[PDB]
Swiss-Prot record:
GO terms, biological process: proteolysis
Protein name per UniProt: Endothiapepsin
Catalytic activity from the UniProt record: Hydrolysis of proteins with specificity similar to that of pepsin A, prefers hydrophobic residues at P1 and P1', but does not cleave 14-Ala-|-Leu-15 in the B chain of insulin or Z-Glu-Tyr. Clots milk
Keywords assigned: Aspartyl protease, Disulfide bond, Hydrolase, Protease, Signal, Zymogen
Lineage: Eukaryota, Fungi, Dikarya, Ascomycota, Pezizomycotina
Transmembrane segments: none
Family the entry assigns: Belongs to the peptidase A1 family.
Sequence ranges assigned to domain Peptidase A1 in this UniProt record: 17-328
Superkingdom of origin: Eukaryota
Residue numbers of the full-length protein present here: 90 to 419 of 419
Class in the EC hierarchy, top level: hydrolase
Active site: 35, 199
Annotated EC: 3.4.23.22
A GO molecular-function annotation: aspartic-type endopeptidase activity
Length: 330
């Protein structure tokens, strides 16, 4: 089997991407944030505290003939940005882009933090990291990908995120029309439950490539590219008037600037992030200070190749016995 779904930016900045997911019988379609940096599929629901719902579409298990309470199971998750959610668990049929899993754990939110309530466009998350990170207790649950894997034509999914445009998540096949050149594969460590890999270095604009190992994760659920402070300072030093602002919480730059590209290494291959991808617009409405898309990972304890980096590539998440990541230009 295979599945193929379109993923759509939630706003004009590509702050996140939503993908429609069918849950239950008859189908309830919710727009989920597919997150390769976490392992819970959780949704706004009929159980969510009413004051914490503001425009999201909810899953109502009582209206699904295939929903069953997973008795005694609870979940609670905290993300890198300080947001959180928790609740109880149902199993139900879940389909993505025509690929169906029966008996998927659907984590129903009883509580969500303010950042979720305030984002009316995201109805929940679908985690695609390794199932060792799933938070269901006392019986850990599998991801949608892990439950689908054995049925797929190939044990892979791909992320093809758009810059200010829709993109695609495919399950079970490589679309050889979706990228240019060849796919370069690189090793993955699953030790922390992430798609953790080592970049071979970077370049700023038309500058020379610096060969250096940068360990980080491929995380579709993180907007920005978080890299070591040395790398980030070298980038922003090429932008006149850029500075790190403790008040704003990262590097800002004049909205009048033209940003340089940023290149990262994948083995002997190179992925180029155009400058425009690094512009996250005014820090507040009408400001002439703009927020940068490349930020320091110092204090986060890991480097994160988030959407700014991943949307410059066709990315293969290879879930074979020995997982690997692939990157191609597009
Ligand atoms: Na922000």
């Amino acid at each position: 089997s295979t599945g193929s779904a379109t993923t759509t930016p939630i706003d004009s900045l590509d702050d996140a991407y939503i993908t429609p997911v069918q849950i239950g019988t008859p189908a309830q379609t919710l727009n989920l944030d597919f997150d390769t940096g976490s392992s819970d599929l959780w949704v706004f629901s009929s159980e969510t505290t009413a004051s914490e719902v503001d425009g999201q579409t909810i899953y109502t298990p009582s209206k699904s003939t295939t929903a069953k309470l997973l008795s005694g199971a609870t979940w609670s998750i905290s993300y890198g940005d300080g947001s959180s959610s928790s609740g109880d668990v149902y199993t139900d049929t879940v389909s993505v882009g025509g690929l169906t899993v029966t008996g998927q754990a659907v984590e129903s939110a009883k509580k969500v933090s303010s950042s979720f309530t305030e984002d009316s466009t995201i109805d929940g998350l679908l985690g695609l990291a390794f199932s060792t990170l799933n938070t269901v207790s006392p019986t850990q649950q599998k991801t949608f990908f892990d439950n689908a894997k054995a049925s797929l034509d190939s044990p892979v999914f791909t992320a093809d995120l758009g810059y200010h445009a829709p993109g695609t998540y495919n399950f079970g096949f490589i679309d050889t029309t979706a990228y240019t050149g060849s796919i370069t594969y690189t090793a993955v460590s699953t030790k922390q439950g992430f798609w953790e890999w080592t970049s071979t270095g970077y370049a700023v604009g038309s500058g020379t490539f610096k060969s250096t190992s940068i360990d980080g994760i491929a995380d579709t659920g993180t907007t920005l590219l978080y890299l070591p402070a040395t790398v980030v300072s070298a980038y922003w030093a090429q932008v006149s008037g850029a500075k790190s602002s403790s008040s704003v919480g990262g590097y800002v730059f004049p909205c009048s600037a033209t940003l340089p590209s940023f290149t990262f290494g994948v083995g002997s291959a190179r992925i180029v992030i155009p400058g425009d991808y690094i512009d996250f617009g005014p820090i507040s409405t009408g400001s002439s200070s703009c927020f940068g898309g490349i930020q320091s990972s110092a204090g986060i304890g890991i480097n994160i190749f988030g959407d700014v980096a991943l949307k410059a590539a066709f990315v293969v998440f290879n879930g074979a016995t020995t997982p690997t990541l692939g990157f191609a230009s597009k």
